């Protein structure tokens, strides 16, 4: 009863006591059960430190490190159905996306491990998410902090955003991989928090597949005069300050282009993730440096402090997060 639980079928199951044993289906997933306690994972979804993901041994568990990748669902990706079987976790945590839940179902029934499922697109659904988490993993106590301070960062970001006109909006380009021609939709998993931040997303049409990473031009980006440039692959942030033909972009010239912090895990995207919580404030704080009411450094110190146990001194924030 107290231990029941609608899975991904929305069929009542009963979950033992004590959950000692625990996987993930997928980063997002994974990165979320580590804040709220590490101990049982079985394993990570990908490698720990990647392209997206960096300088996890500075702050994360040796625990989390050393977990062995048993793959997962998501993109460029597949599960390792064998080794999770063999695994035993006690239950799986699957991401409840559409593009997803397809695939993820029919494996989930091979493999025949418990498994419930969470909506995280939504970033306003985090703090629910983790007092459900909570309750799963009988980490109620933890998991309600982590909600509360979700809760409070995403109220505050809804006001503030809402306090800007429609017409006043930034316009913002996501400017991913290594030449700064894929982008997403302004409706996509992958640019959610952008949105959130009060971002007019320039490139306008509905995610259609997992990975995203629509193709534009260079000429196109040139007709949609962002105002604003966030980018994830520090080779292109680079670039676009080096190469003369970027120099015709109001963003360059005003030098309204940043790079999304990776350490230990994206602020954005590549996974979506909890992290967006944060991520969206420092968004907002480069989308209206004027009118942004919060100094962004603290709230990353706070939420370090709290997700990860991590203490960020001045030259920290400088070195990790340009902040
Ligand atoms: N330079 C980091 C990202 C970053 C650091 N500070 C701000 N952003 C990277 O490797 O992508």
Same mark, same amino acid.
């Given at each position: 009863?107290?231990?029941?639980?609608?899975?991904?079928?929305?069929?009542?199951?009963?979950?033992?006591?004590?959950?000692?044993?625990?996987?993930?289906?997928?980063?997002?997933?994974?990165?979320?059960?580590?804040?709220?306690?590490?101990?049982?994972?079985?394993?990570?979804?990908?490698?720990?430190?990647?392209?997206?993901?960096?300088?996890?041994?500075?702050?994360?568990?040796?625990?989390?490190?050393?977990?062995?990748?048993?793959?997962?669902?998501?993109?460029?990706?597949?599960?390792?159905?064998?080794?999770?079987?063999?695994?035993?976790?006690?239950?799986?945590?699957?991401?409840?996306?559409?593009?997803?839940?397809?695939?993820?179902?029919?494996?989930?029934?091979?493999?025949?491990?418990?498994?419930?499922?969470?909506?995280?697109?939504?970033?306003?659904?985090?703090?629910?998410?983790?007092?459900?988490?909570?309750?799963?993993?009988?980490?109620?106590?933890?998991?309600?902090?982590?909600?509360?301070?979700?809760?409070?960062?995403?109220?505050?970001?809804?006001?503030?955003?809402?306090?800007?006109?429609?017409?006043?909006?930034?316009?913002?380009?996501?400017?991913?991989?290594?030449?700064?021609?894929?982008?997403?939709?302004?409706?996509?998993?992958?640019?959610?928090?952008?949105?959130?931040?009060?971002?007019?997303? $320039?490139? #306008?049409? =509905? /995610? @259609?597949?997992? *990975?995203? !990473?629509?193709?534009? %031009?260079?000429?196109?980006?040139?007709?949609?005069?962002?105002?604003?440039?966030?980018?994830?692959?520090?080779?292109?942030?680079?670039?676009?300050?080096?190469?003369?033909?970027?120099? $015709?972009? #109001?963003? =360059? /010239? @005003?030098?309204? *282009?940043? !790079?999304?912090?990776? %350490?230990?895990?994206?602020?954005?995207?590549?996974?979506?993730?909890?992290?967006?919580?944060?991520?969206?404030?420092?968004?907002?704080?480069?989308?209206?440096?004027?009118?942004?009411?919060?100094?962004?450094?603290?709230?990353?110190?706070?939420?370090?402090?709290?997700?990860?146990?991590?203490?960020?001194?001045?030259?920290?924030?400088?070195?990790?997060?340009?902040?």
């Amino acid at each position: 009863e107290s231990r029941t639980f609608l899975d991904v079928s929305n069929k009542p199951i009963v979950l033992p006591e004590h959950i000692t044993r625990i996987y993930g289906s997928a980063p997002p997933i994974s990165f979320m059960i580590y804040v709220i306690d590490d101990t049982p994972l079985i394993g990570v979804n990908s490698p720990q430190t990647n392209k997206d993901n960096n300088n996890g041994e500075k702050f994360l568990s040796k625990h989390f490190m050393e977990l062995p990748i048993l793959g997962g669902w998501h993109g460029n990706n597949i599960p390792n159905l064998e080794a999770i079987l063999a695994a035993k976790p006690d239950v799986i945590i699957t991401w409840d996306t559409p593009l997803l839940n397809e695939k993820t179902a029919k494996d989930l029934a091979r493999i025949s491990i418990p498994a419930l499922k969470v909506n995280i697109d939504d970033s306003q659904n985090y703090p629910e998410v983790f007092r459900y988490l909570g309750r799963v993993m009988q980490k109620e106590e933890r998991a309600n902090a982590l909600a509360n301070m979700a809760q409070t960062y995403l109220d505050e970001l809804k006001t503030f955003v809402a306090s800007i006109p429609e017409k006043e909006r930034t316009k913002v380009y996501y400017a991913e991989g290594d030449f700064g021609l894929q982008t997403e939709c302004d409706r996509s998993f992958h640019s959610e928090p952008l949105a959130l931040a009060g971002g007019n997303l $320039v490139h #306008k049409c =509905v /995610q @259609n597949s997992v *990975v995203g !990473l629509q193709e534009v %031009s260079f000429e196109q980006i040139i007709l949609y005069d962002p105002e604003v440039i966030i980018v994830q692959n520090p080779t292109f942030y680079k670039t676009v300050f080096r190469e003369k033909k970027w120099a $015709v972009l #109001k963003a =360059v /010239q @005003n030098k309204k *282009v940043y !790079l999304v912090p990776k %350490s230990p895990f994206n602020w954005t995207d590549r996974p979506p993730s909890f992290m967006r919580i944060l991520g969206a404030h420092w968004i907002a704080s480069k989308l209206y440096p004027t009118r942004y009411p919060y100094k962004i450094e603290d709230k990353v110190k706070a939420f370090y402090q709290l997700f990860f146990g991590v203490e960020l001194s001045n030259e920290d924030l400088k070195t990790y997060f340009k902040l």
